[PDB]
Paper text:
In order to improve the compound we first studied the effect of the addition of hydrogen bond donors and acceptors to the ortho- and meta-positions of the phenyl ring (C-ring), which could form additional interactions with the protein. We hypothesized that the nitrogen would not be close enough to form interactions and therefore we tested amine (13 and 14), hydroxyl (15 and 16) and methoxy groups (17 and 18) in both positions, which could act as hydrogen bond donor, donor as well as an acceptor, and an acceptor, respectively. All the substitutions were tolerated except methoxy in ortho-position, which likely causes a conformational change in the compound not compatible with the binding site. Crystal structures revealed that the amine in ortho-position (14) forms a dipole-dipole interaction with the side chain of Tyr1050, which however does not seem provide additional overall binding energy.
Two homologous tankyrases, TNKS1/ARTD5/PARP5a and TNKS2/ARTD6/PARP5b, catalyze a post-translational modification, poly-ADP-ribosylation, of target proteins. Tankyrases are enzymes (EC 2.4.2.30), which belong to a family of proteins known as human Diphtheria toxin-like ADP-ribosyltransferases. Tankyrases control β-catenin phosphorylation through regulation of the stability of destruction complex by ADP-ribosylating Axin and therefore inhibition of tankyrases offers an attractive strategy for treating cancers with increased Wnt-signaling. Tankyrase inhibitors interact with the NAD+ binding groove of the catalytic domain and they bind either to the nicotinamide subsite, the adenosine subsite or span across both sites.
Numbering used by the authors:
A (entry chain A): 952 to 1112
B (entry chain H): 1115 to 1161
Write the structure that this text describes.
């Protein structure tokens, strides 16, 4: 039951999402190995993902968390890069979309830096890069990221390198 | 998936070395995220 609605580049919603994407690019300690060498993106399309069942699943859990945390969901907008983007938008996030070897355990990982999530579009550490050219720094192939509404609730703070 | 730490709903990975890095976050329940926007893009080659 997912439909995708194209946003016009003239829409303030398009513009605020593009600004979050562009403004959260940083340099990475791998010199671009995983995600490629770049300072900015060419945004080709921004689509709103509409699925009533998945939205209600989200808001149900959000209420549960809020009620466990003095009526505070601690909701953020965060990036997610994944080879399973098509499955996620149609069926929702689940255990198949987790990072099993992640430094904070097997869970679903999100980033404030869009460029961090860009490192995972083609798999962990960029995998073998784009399907067509096998290039983690491909400037031709179209990539996709999700910009996601995430309920953090009470979050365990891990200081880490 | 693993469980959240007892009494918590997520983990925040705070950067402690790279001064320019922003936080990363982990959830342990798929129902705690909704994929709002799908962004299609290319990375641009620096000039
Ligand atoms: N590591 C992953 C494995 C499968 C699907 C997605 C990811 C992934 N991991 C991340 C780790 C840290 C910060 C962001 C991400 C992310 O966007 N995707
Ligand atoms: Zn390519």
């Amino acid at each position: 039951g997912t439909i995708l609605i194209d946003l016009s580049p003239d829409d303030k919603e398009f513009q605020s999402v593009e600004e979050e994407m562009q403004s959260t690019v940083r340099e990475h300690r791998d010199g671009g190995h995983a995600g490629g060498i770049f300072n900015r993106y060419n945004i080709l399309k921004i689509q709103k993902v509409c699925n009533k069942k998945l939205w209600e699943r989200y808001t149900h859990r959000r209420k549960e968390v809020s009620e466990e945390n003095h009526n505070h969901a601690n909701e953020r907008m965060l990036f997610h890069g994944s080879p399973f983007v098509n499955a996620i938008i149609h069926k929702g996030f689940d255990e198949r979309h987790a990072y099993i070897g992640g430094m904070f355990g097997a869970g679903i990982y999100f980033a404030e830096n869009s460029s961090k999530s860009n490192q995972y579009v083609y798999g962990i550490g960029g995998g073998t890069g784009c399907p067509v050219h096998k290039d983690r720094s491909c400037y031709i192939c179209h990539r996709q990221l999700l910009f996601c509404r995430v309920t953090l609730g009470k979050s365990f703070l891990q200081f880490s390198a | 998936m693993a469980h959240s730490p007892p009494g918590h709903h997520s983990v925040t990975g705070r950067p402690s070395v790279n001064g320019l890095a922003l936080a990363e976050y982990v959830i342990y329940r798929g129902e705690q995220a909704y994929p709002e926007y799908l962004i299609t893009y290319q990375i641009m080659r620096p000039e």
